[PDB]
Amino acid sequence: ATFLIWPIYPKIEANEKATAVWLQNTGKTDAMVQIRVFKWNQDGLKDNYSEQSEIIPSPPVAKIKAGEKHMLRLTKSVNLPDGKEQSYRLIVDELPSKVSFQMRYSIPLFAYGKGIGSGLTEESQKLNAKNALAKPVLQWSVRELYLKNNGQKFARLSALKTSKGYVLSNSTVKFAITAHELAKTSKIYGVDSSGIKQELIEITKM
Amino acid sequence: HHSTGCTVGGTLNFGKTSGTWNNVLTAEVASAATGGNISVTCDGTDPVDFTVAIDGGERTDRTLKNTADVVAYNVYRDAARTNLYVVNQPQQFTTVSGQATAVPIFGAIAPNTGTPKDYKDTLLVTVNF
């Protein structure tokens, strides 16, 4: 089946009780989906998921007829820890000699505590301007290339340049590699799409 | 601020796989003209990166079961089948502004020739944004 998913980068601000993701069956046949939210971290240089009770999806199961647009509600159970960005994945499982396909769609979901925001709105931009750590702060080293985020916000990098995926907050991520090109400078640069527009951020050597 | 939306979506039939066969069995979900395919289209103006991982099937080894005997198969990103969809491992894609990025899936079964045999399996295709 065919789905339009909007927005693809949902988030819940500190002052917001819930957000909405819209699922529309843009196809000709009916579809049945399961909606789940898992907590997301990058401990041990790997993406880890786990059951969680902070963000509640509604409904957990939905029959989406052809053409029908459904509103998925993502509700915060309680307020989140101050000044911190929580990471989640929203999982949409499409339920059904030949081998057939079962589609699973995964999009990031971020939720904020007091004092930090997404930076996708004026309100949250003025918030993060008062916070020195409300941004990705990436350091790099070579073992493969390691990226350590010391800021309170995630980075989403499309490319790395010697001259001008996800790295969650307070996390270190490993990438396969350019190593001599790495050992030839001190700062590299990454194209980050975590904010309102693509921007180069400075990555300093560890 | 422009919120990106993306359209996603939206069967490898190897034919009869009973008995024996001397050549490679092939099937594909890669083109609208070939029957249809999986694709991703996002409404923004900047490219959107995403990842496709395919599991190992009902038995995690990618084999079709008779429902009464198995037959090993694999799924590739490539018609020449040089680029395997290695089980559960991400495969990198990127969208182009205003255009559909296909997620092509090419299936193959090695020649049997010796040892004669419905056959079904379900693959989980995970698209990660």
Automatic annotation (TrEMBL), chain A:
GO BP term (any one): cell wall organization
GO annotations of cellular component type: outer membrane-bounded periplasmic space
UniProt cross-references to SUPFAM superfamilies, sorted A to Z: PapD-like
Protein name: CsuC
PANTHER family: PILUS ASSEMBLY CHAPERONE, SLR1668 PROTEIN
Gene3D superfamilies according to UniProt: Immunoglobulins (2.60.40.10)
Name of one Pfam family that matches: PapD_N
Organism (species): Acinetobacter baumannii
Primary gene name: csuC
Every Pili assembly chaperone N-terminal domain range: 13-111
UniProtKB/TrEMBL annotation, chain B:
Keyword Signal: yes
S-S bonds: 6-42
Chain ranges of the Spore coat protein U/FanG domain: 3-126
Keywords, alphabetical: Signal
Keyword Signal belongs to the record: yes
Record-given protein name: CsuA/B
Species assigned in the record: Acinetobacter baumannii
